[PDB]
């Protein structure tokens, strides 16, 4: 269905912009307590650290699993999301995260 | 030891590290690509949905029934557990009913 696509495309813009309105009203912190369960919110803290270390190229796929616990699969999302994203995220993402 | 405060304060920092990230991708517009990458498919289908549950509570319309026939197990994200609906700041609650509910 395109229509369901469409309906779901507007209700995860209407959280994204919900979350920036709350940025902008300094509420981020509270209103991410509130929409992320605790395990999604560790998720998302060890995620930066797996991008960090796939751009970096340094951790081959089993050091990533002893660091992370990250998995094969895992590890392939990461780098198929990297490869999926915008080049100007994946430019900005190696200026931030190795800096 | 049974309790690492070390640790809470490492994933403490991990998590501050993402909420900044995002900060400064809304800064410069690429929040979008940012959440598409940072989430999965069914976390950011998860959290459009989550939206609906906080704007059906603090709307009032809906029965107990009729949020669970909806919404199902995943309400108790909201409703339930360690940041819950009910225990949100004052001023977060307020906020979501002007937006929500305008």
Redesign the interface.
């Given at each position: 269905s395109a229509a369901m696509a469409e309906q779901?495309h507007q209700?995860?813009l209407?959280?994204?912009d919900?979350?920036?309105?709350?940025?902008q009203?300094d509420?981020?912190?509270?209103?991410?307590?509130?929409?992320?369960?605790?395990d999604?919110?560790?998720a998302?803290?060890?995620?930066?650290?797996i991008?960090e270390e796939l751009l970096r190229g340094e951790m081959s796929q089993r050091e990533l699993k002893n660091e992370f616990g990250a998995g094969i699969a895992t590890i392939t999302?990461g780098s198929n999301?990297?490869k999926?994203?915008?080049v100007?995220?994946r430019q900005?993402?190696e200026e931030?995260?190795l800096k």
């Open positions: 779901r209700e995860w209407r959280f994204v919900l979350l920036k309105n709350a940025y009203n509420l981020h912190l509270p209103l991410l307590n509130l929409m992320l369960t605790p999604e919110r560790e998302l803290g060890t995620r930066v650290r991008v999302r999301s990297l999926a994203a915008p100007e995220l900005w993402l931030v995260l």
